[model samples]
Target chain A: HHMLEAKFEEASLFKRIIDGFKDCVQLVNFQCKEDGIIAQAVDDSRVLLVSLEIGVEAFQEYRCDHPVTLGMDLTSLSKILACGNNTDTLTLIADNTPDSIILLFEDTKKDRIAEYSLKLMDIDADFLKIEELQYDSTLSLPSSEFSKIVRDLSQLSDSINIMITKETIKFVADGDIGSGSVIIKPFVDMEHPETSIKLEMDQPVDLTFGAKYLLDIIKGSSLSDRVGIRLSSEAPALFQFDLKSGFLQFFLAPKF
Target chain B: HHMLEAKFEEASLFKRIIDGFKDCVQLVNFQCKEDGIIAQAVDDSRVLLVSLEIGVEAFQEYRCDHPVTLGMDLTSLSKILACGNNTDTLTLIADNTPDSIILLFEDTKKDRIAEYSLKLMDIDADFLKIEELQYDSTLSLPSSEFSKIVRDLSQLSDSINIMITKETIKFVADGDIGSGSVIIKPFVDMEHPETSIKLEMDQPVDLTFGAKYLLDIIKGSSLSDRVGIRLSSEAPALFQFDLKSGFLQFFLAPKF
Candidate 1:
């Protein structure tokens, strides 16, 4: 049975999603369903879990008669994705019992095309079932600003202590060299309200997270202008980057 | 004697120039004089020569009582430059018989300041004096296009064979995967005339150069919109990137 065939207007969106997982997760299983695609993987370190979901509406054309789990090596998938140009239309094909998935990239005029068939693998998939929980605090800020803060603090320390209050958010890094902190207060611009920093807090949450993992998660900043950060004391923190028709989320275990 | 003091409105220009040399040339001696600063260094491979010059007028404020040569490590200087923000004003100072040079980066309002003292070194410098010669062909094109061509060809092979004729310039790369070539013809854009591709040829010339070195030189593409290429049969090719008030040139020997 040919169970899946999907086409995307641009390959860049898929490329970015795959590349984001390359640094942390090595292997992942993408579940193709009638509605869309769902993929999840826990990093080798067991400290980070990444979940991705893309709806059928995101694809230019899609069809799936039955569900299928296609396990793949992220490194290999990312390299194959690199072969397609950003402006190229991407098409994916998979048969009922496929050992490989075929990716076809075509120009708008259909004059140039590139095809790649990536070998699939029988990956050990321990599908993680994560419970939904209300966070003590949720902070939304410009993804660019968030990336800059994490990257800058990484130079000071490997771990970052994040503190959230109703009025402001602060990030503190301490290391052998010294200590540094950045305080950001809620600011709303009337002209560009979408970029305004918004915070919802039930209680103040103080958490420490690995700066390196945070840096890796924020690499998806290019996919979205703003990042939503959900946190709870001593629990896994959720960093969500919303795509146009899907969402890429990372759950990072708090560093003690 | 401390013989040099210069101030630049923005540190980004200098930072980019120094970073470009970090990959190929490790040590360089900057000759500070009334006219400007001149630095040259040949790579360890003995195939690439990099020469940099910046006029005193490029500095917001500059003073040099006497000519002095400051021998420094490019890696260290590049790191120090990274510490300064792109918007910061950078000031360089050295005193007579100085063991170290002081760099001051100041915010426009002078509220924030970062100072770094980089220790100088006693480096063996072999100054090369290159004689100018008329080339068989000269091609000028957008630096972005030039970089894209070299970088794309790099994936195909280690060495790139370039052919220049009266009508077109071509780059060819060959590897086990096969061979690839990109041919570009002269086309002047009437609207955005500055971005036009222009070529002047006295005779056809063909040469091969290491793709790695070409990629390294093109890293300075950010400094200029267009790059000047001068080629002669079996001679060291010249790639010049013009800066606001200076020029950075690279000479890469042909691969036999």
Candidate 2:
């Protein structure tokens, strides 16, 4: 039975999650339980992976009598979300018939409401059984800065190499046209400490990754001010974006 | 024979012309003369036609000792324009040899510069033989308003019919979902006639045109605050976008 329902008090949480999912995959299956909702997907290229968890504590109203799964095309849903203003509330509903899912958007302040129902499908996407990755190096930096670096370097090369040490973290990209890199030294500033890079490391690590994937994951910048990036010399990098009470995670495999 | 050279004091004007031209044709020929630079082209479908004139007075330093035609793909040129800052001055140079054109963008305040050399091409474009059409109706309206209506109605249909009468001028677009229209009535405001509709006509007129073409032409809104639209049952409608001292004109044939 598809009687899973939830109401978002504000668009901040819902819009963030939907936009992040759009960068990872086309169709996503939401597994709803009494606790909250969970969605995860990997891109067709088998190089990028992403997952998000929204706890019941984050929603205004939650009513999932039983666990149920609903599927949707993230692109279509994101398109409709674009119609909503910041002062809007979004609701998700699924009735006894599990073949479809209903979405309701209300511009609460303006008192205008739009409703849409998308035909659901049975998604057979399997999650990647990634190992319990203990990254050699983990660092926290301002999401906006990270997004800018990815975008700026994308103009030069398709791949970027990230080097992290106790002293500094640097990203380098080069192409036939030119080469460019950004280096961030460990610093402390009480006024804008969020912009500083704080690193935790067992050893210095360097990894080369596709810039396009990093660009997609850093789009999570819009969701949070600071993002945690975990890097392992032998495995894919993890980009962890934290919401107020929820979490969104992304993984991008290294090139070499 | 590449001795054409020019410098633009501000990127605002030249960038808009190139951006608008990119929407119609990829390749464009610059007809350089002792006077200034003129470019004209029609889209592949022959549905939209555009022409731009940058008089010698617009440039800080203009040197076209001899007249010649230079061909180029507007897309590649537009990309470099994106790199320009509002404070930057753009310069175009072709000296001694005509195989390619060099574009230099200088941000004097920041002491930063970017240079690109694009290979020239051979273009064989035919001009539109549009006569001085004494249209049945002609009107000038705020470019922002026209741009807004085209964008809003494009959500409903790709074709829009414009009806002009003595009282009101209305734009209507209809599709499977629904129909929506924006109407404006004659008003007399001496302070800023640019924000009001000033119509010139001997008879009322109604014509159906492709909304996409109208949308592309209105993007020239950034060049000026007001746009003059000339409509006729006999010929293509002309959209006149005026610069402070230059001009850009676009034409789109009605959908029969």
Candidate 3:
């Protein structure tokens, strides 16, 4: 027997990472476990992968008498969450043999309530064994700035090249029509201090990937203020975001 | 044989009516006149018609040195207006021999400026001479309330029946699936005196119309707070929204 119930005073953070899951795949495997909840999925081609983990500390009210794995359509969940605003409290409840999940929204300030129930499907969650590696370069920068760069390059070409050096990081996109480039320099204490982008490189690394995928990945900008990126010339690039009480990450393999 | 120039602090009111036109026809004709500006269009189906007239008092600055009729595609004009926000002041300048009309948006509050030049097309705006009639019933109500009624009834059927009685007005929509209804009563003043709906009927008149068309008419809700509806059993109904300085009117024929 299992009784799953959880509540979050603010659900936008949850919605933000779910948006990232939507960008990678349609169906996501959500687990309500003893320690916490884990939501993960990988695209059919295995090119894009996303995983989100939230501990009990992430919610004001967390209860799961028994651990249960639920297969959910991300599209439906996103729509259900959309019924509530960012600041609204959201509650979810399900039975052990639940065929569906019940979602409730309460606006304490407005004294309003809205609810919806979505049917769940019987689906399998595949284990994604990602290899850990020490990257040649890893950069931590504002998600907004990264999103902006992706948008600018998207206008020019389908693919973008990322080049990292000691002083600056550059994104270049060139196609039949034209070429576009954005160079982001590390902030110097003497010149400017409030910059969000800072670059670091152990050894110079350059990689080329489809710019469209980068755009899709950055759509989760609301997940966090900044993003951590780890990259190498040959392997997949790892993008990570921390949400104080939880963590979200995406892995995208280079096109060439 | 003249220059027509006008400027308004807010152009969203114009955008609302244009949205109604876009629902009907794409290529619309805008006429700049001595009194004000007129943008009107009728859908090719001959069932829906929209006419918007803004007087000189509506704008902070209005100058029609010469009256000119300019043919414009509603699609292109919409794109130009999309550049500026609702609160931004919009300026239009065009000469009699002009091939294009220049639109300038200056946000004095924000200290920002954007400009666009739209190539004018050689289109025609025909005057639709609708039959003059004395309506059997007339109702003045909040656009928001009317919009809600349209939305609620839309779920049941494409058509809805508006019945007028001495005490209240009722919208009844029934289909093979189910039925829905809404009854609105006028204000009887005492404590809660801010009544959104007020009705007047010369006789008990019942009329049937497409719910979708009513929804389209309500799309211009931003045009005004209240809408005045006049109807007759044998003729089309007139839905009018009065701007502080001008007016917008839509005449939709009965579906049957």
Candidate 4:
């Protein structure tokens, strides 16, 4: 019996998640448990930490007998996953103490199938214990808007100052060319409720972060339409994108 | 009265043509006459030459009182053109002996308009007259098919050998990894007659070209559905892409 067997009806979400982080982190450990799958990785600079989770309900079919840590190179896995069509069914199989992992892509309508075997490696990574913490402000906005802000302001400065109040959330940057700021207030459209901007703040908070790290973290926008930002004074900021049954989150320390 | 006034219904075709050559050539001279527009540029290495032409009929509105050569940096022009939407109407205006050219992008529906004035410089570029010459063989094929062949064979070698006979046209490459060849025997599809491959051969010719140059030249495929290749045994090769009312052609000197 295989130690872990998981199938995804469409490999789009999985592929996007891996592609977003493949360039930032070289190796990652996929911890397969009876409940779901979890992975955590820290960037080379040690200022950003990324955590990913996929619940069993997210998969078309999933079976896991025991817990196993499958360490794989993110770049190599990304290349292999790129071979599968977005609409193809992706099946991942691994045996206990196996030296290699197997992947199967099937298109029943076209009667086509492809199988790949990639050798696994031992990766020494410590999962940081991120205790449950509360933030003074939590803001939810369209992922596209967040990505655009990070990209546009990047032209002005390498660092961005983020400020949140009861009324709105604003991002500001200053550079030799000029200074720019983008502010978003709470707004809701009845037709597209999911893309609405929301903010819940008990106390005002202000923080600054490197625009380069935020640019890479926002690439997770491909996984969800909305993104949640949690912030506190003199504390790390948490950016999260919700998946079908789980979520991918990143924590970036504020620059002094 | 303006010396030259040209209007394009959709700026997509113009943008694509300029983008393809912007990276290869820094400065270009656009010769505007009562009949049409003509441009010629030689790559830094001098191994490849590009020629572009657009007849008056190609534009939605065209007016010219005299001939004038406007010299401008392609990279800078590309940046200004990028500010325009593909669906927007583009208008170019210039005066006789003008020091700067004017560009206007308009969205009549939304009442949005953008105007940019780019200063022109006097470029000392000599336009070489390409003498009319007949080739031993002329091969026609789908532009996408040609691009794919150049890309796939690039994995095996830096140089590609092209062999043309009455029956088939073959592309071969050899490298440290291995050797691969692709042969296409022209056949016709009634539904998509424009995409059909055909050949007119006076004699057989085999030639070798650098894959790097072909990769850059094939970016012109966005302008046409099909491409024409005219070659002779120990002479420069001609690759042409048909425009709406004119053509864009590249002549590359083959390596011995």
lDDT by candidate, in order shown: 0.84, 0.78, 0.77, 0.83
Clashing residue pairs, backbone N/CA/C < 3 A, model 1? B1-B95, B1-B96, B1-B97, B2-B95, B2-B96
lDDT of 2 by residue, A1-256 (tens): 3467788987666877777658668777778888998877777888887878889988888889877777777777787677666657878888764787777787877568888777887888575667445789999888986886677666667898888878778887766444555566665557877766688888798899898788788888778898998888888888888987788888888995
TM-score of 4: 0.55
lDDT tens digits, residues A1-256, model 1? 4578889999988988887667888888999999999998877889999899999989999998888889988889988999999989998889988899999999999899999999998976677866357888999999887886777667657898989987878887766433456667776778887668888999998999998898899887867889999998857999998987899999999977
Q: Which tens-of-lDDT digit does each residue in B155-217 have in candidate 1?
A: 999999989877899999999988899999999999997789999999899999999898898
lDDT winner, 1 or 2 = 1
lDDT of 4 by residue, B2-51 (tens): 77899988877789888666766777888888998988878788888888
Q: Cα lDDT for residue B131, model 2?
A: 44
Q: Which TM-score does chain B of candidate 3 obtain?
A: 0.90
- Ten contiguous residues with the weakest lDDT in model 2 chain A: A174-183
Q: Which stretches of candidate 2 lie over 4 Å from their true place?
A: A1-256, B129-133
Q: What tens digits encode model 3's per-residue C-alpha lDDT throughout A37-122?
A: 88777777878888788989988888898878788877667766554567878777889778877776666543234445667868
* lDDT score for residue A192 of model 4: 85
Task: Name every residue pair that clashes in candidate 2.
Answer: none
iRMS, all models: 6.8, 7.1, 8.8, 8.2
In angstroms, give how far residue A232 of model 1 lies from its true place: 1.0
**Across residues B69-111, which tens digit of lDDT does each residue of candidate 3 receive?**
7778778888777787887778888987779998888787767
Give the docking tier of candidate 2: incorrect
Model 1 bad stretches (over 4 Å): B1-85, B88-256
Total backbone collisions for each predicted model: 5, 0, 1, 0
Weakest ten-residue segment in model 2 chain B by summed lDDT: B107-116
Tens digits of lDDT, candidate 4, A170-235: 887765433556666677667988868888998898899999898888898778889999997756
Error in Å for residue B113 of model 4? 1.5
